[PDB]
Design a protein around this ligand. Structure first.
Ligand SMILES: *Cc1cc2c(cc1C)nc1c(=O)[nH]c(=O)nc-1n2C[C@H](O)[C@H](O)[C@H](O)COP(=O)(O)OP(=O)(O)OC[C@H]1O[C@@H](n2cnc3c(N)ncnc32)[C@H](O)[C@@H]1O
Ligand SMILES: *Cc1cc2c(cc1C)nc1c(=O)[nH]c(=O)nc-1n2C[C@H](O)[C@H](O)[C@H](O)COP(=O)(O)OP(=O)(O)OC[C@H]1O[C@@H](n2cnc3c(N)ncnc32)[C@H](O)[C@@H]1O
Ligand SMILES: O=C(O)/C=C/C(=O)O
Ligand SMILES: O=C(O)/C=C/C(=O)O
Ligand SMILES: [Ca+2]
Ligand SMILES: [Ca+2]
Lengths: 655, 655
């Protein structure tokens, strides 16, 4: 048998995984990072919008702080998040930005002077004073009143990922690519590592560690239309689920993006850098003002996606061989001034859409984009399976609830990498494990036998058409608008699809470097993940955040102010087991109310929300009278934990 | 922490260790071989005499079989060996030779024709028939009536070692050199591996395995004068001893060689290939005929060593700056015929002694040569510490008792590698271990702290003079002739030496590639090994095999027909704990009697020996009358075990 040992095993080489590896390696814990691909090619590298952090450097960031960022996050989550985790996040984001700056990330900086446009109306000139010069700049992104999205020109995710990966190399972290975790080794409710398949040689290897962290990203690829890389298939989520003990949280909470290029899914950051992009229908008609007279195209992205679908169902969409879509027109610009970098989007359209934005319109359609759901953890990042941690998009640490704030996800990846990294390191240093060879051999030989059965299978099903059928079902029935009848049917077909995946047969019999063998074991995993999303969507009879039930259009704070927990106890069951974790209103710093976007008064009020709200109002007014600061008032409303390393305050311009 | 795992851990890259690694690796068990030096430089490579195996190919080997080889072995051991183990050995030796032949070992072959000399007297012409042509040849070595020592010209150990090492490379055995095992990891009476120090980088690493085998060779270097390589220091024996559970067997049983070059210890195989070498004293007098009128120089090597010491104590030795010695004269030859290879010894004398044998005489003195003693195991090669095996000179499997048969040791290395290899493989495949990180960390950090204390020690003792003082004490008091008074004093000085070794201080403070640090931890280990030998020699009040007590000149089969078992239970004690394992006369195929060499009737007879002897005589005569064969008679006298793979009979010329 082949066995590799390390003190801290990290599964996933994205921003979250690499940052967590830095935390453990810097304290002498031997650490290995496993990844399907070279870590610098992870999906994190595609982030072009930016990272959210309340620095308060620029004019449009003036007066920003943890409280304001916290509020935007909670309301955005439509009260589905763990508010304490959100506090840990907003408080730590500023220091994540600054640490990366010290690591060389070339953040765009502020320079003295005036700027034009970049505003909805009224004002149009921005002035950056001399004392702001040279500090990290910010842009308007995510729809927050205060501009706090930091960026390194047009490749933020890329420069961030490279810096964290370089730090790993500097520290001597062991990075092993083209290696895939296909199962978790566990016994007596404890995780002792993972069974790994070497994608090149085909060897099945056991990686044992005192602690294991899963930072495998999202599961967007279960949908046909997604912005996600080809590797975001949710297998990290699946192996966690297949332990029969670790639980998945809010898998039904999927976020879409309104303007990806159709049908590729390639992101056109059009209308971002400089608002001007106009959405048009089949008649060239600018429809957004018809649904949103005030906000128009600048409405909440959440709203824009819905309106685009509504307009298409109204029969005003453009027909094409790949389905219906709409138009994105930016030609209305095609020129400006200079003094800084502002030229990219055209290339995307020319290289793929095969056209110049300044001339023709780009085809677009809302597509899957982010996965709020993931492995359920406590505030420390540990799952119900002891010794198993998770961070990043792969987790449901839950600072996102039912709607992630634009710019908060790449931020969570690094922030969670820092925080969960500390708790993960602590666990790995203090815990003591019993590594039984009997258990190791069982899991290892079990996967070798599994690989052999797949290669020897005389099944007649085709893995590719089963995977494609799954993606269609998810897109057609588990998208922006959902209803019981269709969810019912999708769940039924997915379950049927899952049973057929077990009768797959492949042509290539080799055990090494086999793309076909890879699909044969990954698809069944993706189907289990899909079932959790679909079934979770069917049973959740309410509309919350990105989850919209046309048959239950209102947010039900009485029966659904909770979190969906999915598990798969019996390896033979064909449907996930769903449970619910209720959110304690008393443990909230901000009581449930209007989320700030979408229709008004569209939620069933919970008597306790009113009760808690009054208490909050009272507790604040009093302490505020006694001349107590926001830090003391926050602590009185909802105390939260932070590891020693990060409990310091964040210095801001003009304290 | 750094941890390496494998199914089978082999400590020692000599003939025994490498052959055992082949046995485990060939059955899919991942195996690692640890060695201080590149394996092909192990002491096994110095063997020039040959390997003993009853092939029965040549004229002078005619009629040889397992029984004859068995008898020579038992009588040679002076009844101190486990006769069942000896049976396993002689039966398997023929197949070890043949397997090596299939592996390319260039054994010298027989050719049709006549040969001269190579005889004591009477006959002088040997004829090899045509049906013997092309088969593996044999020479006169070890004093056995039947010539059964196989050889590849003048470099038998070398070609054998290379072939076994090459087979390891072929199978992909993981060979890690410049790596030293400094402690064994154990818990609840089970061995889970070893703590290893990387001689190059200085890293302390834990190698864990389901089974661990120690094949680290002899401990000849505790003596000042030895034929052994500079690395035969007994540290493998020591780490076994320091577990407080594994036991050492007959450590006092040390064999000397009569004619190594003085004072280097370089072996002069003079008088071997072609008898002619004459021993002379300070007056040029040929003294051997004075003590042994009949056998003269051709007497048992055991006897020659004693006479040489006697002659020196008689004041007829040669004085030199390095001590007293005698002369070896081969000039009496310096010429012959041809038809085969016969030229080497001269070079040894010219390159080191700086002289031509055909002219001047070579200085010689008996020196330590072989270690019968070693780690005590059962017939399977497993020690009292479960999961810990041992094979080769490092073990006391005990087929040697108190006197190894010339040519049997290189034979045991390979044979034990084959047999113990099978049992070791079986153990590794069937056992299941509980690897606790708490236990691993304890042993690893314990050795790191130990290394740190050595480097930080402000002690004033000099490790080199303490090691040199030890070697002198061993040579002066624990040599060919021993007596209670001197052994008493040596044990006392060794114990005192051991206490001072703990107050050593070194100049070079680095943790990597540090020769001085190496001595600081190896010397204390050597001292514990020396103490076992010395104390074992003092308490054994009898003369047996190579162990000679001038105050107890007789072999006592009544009170000492047993084996000395040494242990070190309390890590704080300064003297080993000695126990005895009695040899059951009823479990013997050959009852105790005259060993065949040395003075007649020099042993206290045991009433049970006579009882058992009669029973043997009876059981044989009867079964022989019934026309039963030697195989059936042997089984009726003393049945023994052999793994399935080697229980077949050995085909011989003319069956
Ligand atoms: C898709 C996307 C997302 C995105 C964005 C633009 C695009 C096109 N722009 C963003 C922005 O401007 N601001 C923002 O806040 N977020 C933005 N996002 C989303 C964001 O980039 C992601 O949420 C974030 O990068 C996720 O980081 P994370 O570290 O969690 O994960 P990752 O980068 O996807 O990497 C996953 C790693 O896991 C390895 N892996 C996966 N499965 C396995 C298995 N089974 N075994 C071994 N390794 C595995 C992958 O190889 C990878 O390295
Ligand atoms: C010294 C000698 C012995 C000898 C001989 C000639 C000389 C000069 N001629 C012989 C002959 O003609 N016929 C015969 O039957 N025997 C003869 N012998 C004795 C014989 O060669 C030995 O008994 C035999 O070769 C021993 O083999 P074994 O496999 O047991 O051991 P080795 O070759 O000495 O190798 C020991 C290995 O252990 C490694 N080692 C030692 N300590 C450690 C620690 N602490 N950690 C890691 N590795 C360790 C050594 O590096 C080596 O590889
Ligand atoms: O619109 C974008 O380019 C990125 C959005 C994201 O933060 O997910
Ligand atoms: O006399 C020799 O060369 C070797 C003797 C040995 O077998 O130990
Ligand atoms: Ca998630
Ligand atoms: Ca021995």
């Amino acid at each position: 048998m082949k066995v590799q040992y390390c003190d801290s095993l990290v599964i996933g080489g994205g921003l979250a995984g690499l940052r967590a590896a830095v935390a453990t390696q810097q304290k002498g814990l031997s650490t290995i990072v496993l990844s399907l691909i070279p870590v610098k090619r992870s999906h994190s590298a595609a982030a072009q919008g930016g990272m959210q952090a309340s620095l308060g450097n620029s004019k449009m960031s003036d007066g920003d702080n943890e409280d304001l960022h916290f509020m935007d996050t909670v309301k955005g989550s439509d009260w589905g998040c763990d508010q304490k985790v959100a506090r840990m996040f907003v408080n730590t984001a500023p220091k994540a930005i600054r640490e990366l700056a010290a690591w060389g990330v070339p953040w765009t900086r502020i320079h003295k002077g005036d700027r034009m446009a970049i505003i909805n109306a009224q004002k149009t000139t921005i002035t950056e004073e001399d004392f702001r010069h040279g500090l990290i700049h910010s842009r308007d992104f995510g729809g927050t009143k205060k501009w706090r999205t930091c960026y390194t020109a047009d490749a933020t995710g890329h420069t961030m990922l490279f810096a964290v990966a370089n730090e790993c190399l500097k520290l001597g972290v062991s990075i092993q690519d083209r290696k895939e975790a296909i199962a978790l080794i566990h016994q007596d409710g404890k995780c002792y590592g993972a069974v790994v398949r070497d994608l090149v040689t085909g060897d099945i290897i056991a990686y044992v560690a005192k602690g294991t962290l899963i930072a495998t990203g999202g599961y967007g690829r279960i949908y046909k239309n997604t912005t996600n890389a080809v590797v975001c298939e949710g297998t990290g989520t699946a192996i966690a689920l297949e332990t029969g003990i670790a639980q998945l949280g809010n898998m039904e909470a999927v976020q879409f993006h309104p303007t990806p290029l159709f049908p590729s899914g390639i992101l056109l950051t059009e209308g971002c850098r400089g608002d001007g992009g106009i959405l048009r229908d089949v008649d060239g008609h600018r429809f957004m003002p018809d649904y949103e007279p005030e906000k128009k195209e600048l409405a909440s992205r959440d709203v824009v996606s819905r309106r685009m679908i509504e307009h298409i169902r109204k029969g005003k969409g453009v027909q094409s061989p790949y389905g219906q879509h709409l138009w994105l027109d930016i030609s209305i610009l095609g020129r400006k001034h200079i003094e800084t970098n502002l030229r990219d989007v055209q290339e995307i359209c020319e290289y793929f859409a095969g056209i110049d934005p300044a001339e023709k319109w780009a085809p677009v359609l809302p597509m899957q984009h982010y996965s709020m759901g993931g492995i359920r953890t406590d505030y420390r990042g540990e799952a119900k399976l002891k010794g198993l941690f998770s961070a990043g998009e792969a987790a449901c640490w839950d600072m996102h609830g039912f709607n992630r704030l634009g710019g908060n996800s790449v931020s969570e990846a690094v922030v969670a990498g820092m925080i969960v990294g500390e708790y993960f390191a602590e666990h790995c240093a203090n815990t003591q494990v019993d590594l039984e060879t009997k258990t190791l051999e069982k899991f290892v030989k079990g996967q070798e036998a599994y690989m052999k059965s797949l290669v020897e299978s005389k099944g007649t099903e085709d893995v590719f058409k089963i995977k494609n059928r799954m993606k269609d079902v998810m897109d057609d029935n588990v998208g922006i608008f959902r209803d019981g009848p269709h969810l019912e049917k999708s769940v039924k077909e997915l379950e049927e699809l899952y049973k057929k995946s077990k009768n797959v047969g492949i042509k290539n019999k080799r055990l090494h470097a086999n793309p076909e063998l890879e699909e044969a074991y990954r698809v069944p995993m993706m189907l289990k993940v899909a079932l959790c999303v679909a079934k979770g969507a069917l049973d959740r009879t309410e509309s919350r955040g990105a989850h919209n039930r046309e048959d239950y259009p209102k947010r039900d704070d009485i029966n659904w102010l909770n979190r969906t927990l999915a598990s798969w106890p019996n390896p033979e069951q064909t449907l996930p087991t769903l449970e619910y974790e209720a959110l304690d209103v008393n443990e909230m710093e901000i009581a449930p109310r209007y989320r700030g976007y979408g229709a008004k008064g569209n939620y069933i009020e919970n008597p306790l929300s009113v009760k808690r709200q009054e208490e909050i109002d009272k507790i604040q007014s009093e302490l505020e009278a006694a001349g107590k600061d926001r830090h003391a008032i926050q602590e009185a409303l909802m105390p939260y934990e932070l590891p020693a390393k990060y409990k310091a305050r964040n210095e801001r311009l003009g304290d």
